[PDB]
Ligand binder design. Structure first.
Ligand SMILES: *[C@@H]1O[C@H](CO[C@@H]2O[C@@H](C)[C@@H](O)[C@@H](O)[C@@H]2O)[C@@H](O[C@@H]2O[C@H](CO)[C@@H](O)[C@H](O)[C@H]2NC(C)=O)[C@H](O)[C@H]1NC(C)=O
Ligand SMILES: *[C@@H]1O[C@H](CO)[C@@H](O[C@@H]2O[C@H](CO)[C@@H](O)[C@H](O)[C@H]2NC(C)=O)[C@H](O)[C@H]1NC(C)=O
Ligand code: NAG
Lengths: 85, 100
């Protein structure tokens, strides 16, 4: 009658989970960083997942990029990076 | 007949709110502002903010110590400037002086 009512439809993340994360993956003397997501681990295996929704994927060279060696990154861990070739 | 009414929220409660905001933004980044607080290592969060400004994560991860040192030096300089500037809080002082 004298104003406006906005119905805001928003996305609220829910049902979080513990995960072990690392800044980068050390493989063949190279440091791999996720292109779009984050490295996580359920306890035994390492995956790369997107940000606001848990979707674990195999860490490959397509979803990661290489920058330098493993000497400078603090918290880097060893894990294998799959090469689809 | 002129009196001053105390504010509803004390300085202690405002400080507690500020400390809660600080803890949330330090331990969870921007997640606690949009929903549940999701814990995250702080260097990873700063790499996130580097991504937001268009800088890759490796730039941060190869210069983490330098970035931390620069941040600490900037915080110290801010404290020193606020302590030494003759008129730094001029807006709040002007509001109080106008009311008085
Ligand atoms: C993570 O790995 C590094 C590097 O080791 C390389 O990768 C491994 C997966 C394996 O293939 C090694 O043969 C490779 O050399 C580890 O650093 C080594 O640490 C040991 C003792 O811990 C030391 O004797 C080696 O010289 C180190 N390697 C090098 C190249 O300097 C590192 O310890 C691993 N991290 C964890 C937590 O296990
Ligand atoms: C972490 O997730 C991985 C997903 O690959 C799990 O490993 C798989 O587990 C299933 C379930 O038995 C097996 O069928 C697969 O063969 C496993 N894959 C590999 C490569 O071993 C793993 O078990 C999970 N770890 C935890 C602690 O939950
Ligand atoms: C995540 O880890 C913390 C560590 O104590 C734990 O309290 C919390 O319940 C965990 N969250 C989930 C969803 O498992």
């Amino acid at each position: 009658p004298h104003g406006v009512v906005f119905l805001h439809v928003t996305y609220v993340p829910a049902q979080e989970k513990n995960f072990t994360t690392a800044p980068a993956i050390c493989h063949d003397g190279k440091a791999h960083f996720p292109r779009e997501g984050v490295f996580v681990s359920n306890g035994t295996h390492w995956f790369v997942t997107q940000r606001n929704f848990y979707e674990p994927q195999i860490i490959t060279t397509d979803n990661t990029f290489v920058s330098g060696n493993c000497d400078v990154v603090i918290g880097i861990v060893n894990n294998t990076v799959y090469d689809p070739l | 007949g002129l009196t001053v009414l105390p504010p509803l929220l004390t300085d202690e409660m405002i400080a507690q709110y500020t400390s809660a905001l600080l803890a949330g933004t330090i331990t969870s980044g921007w997640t606690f502002g949009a929903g549940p607080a999701l814990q995250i290592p702080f260097p990873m969060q700063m790499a996130y903010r580097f991504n937001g400004i268009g800088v890759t994560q490796n730039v941060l991860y190869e210069n983490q110590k330098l970035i931390a040192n620069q941040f600490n030096s900037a915080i110290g300089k801010i404290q020193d400037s606020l302590s030494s500037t003759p008129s730094a809080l001029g807006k709040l002082q002007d509001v109080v002086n106008h009311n008085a």
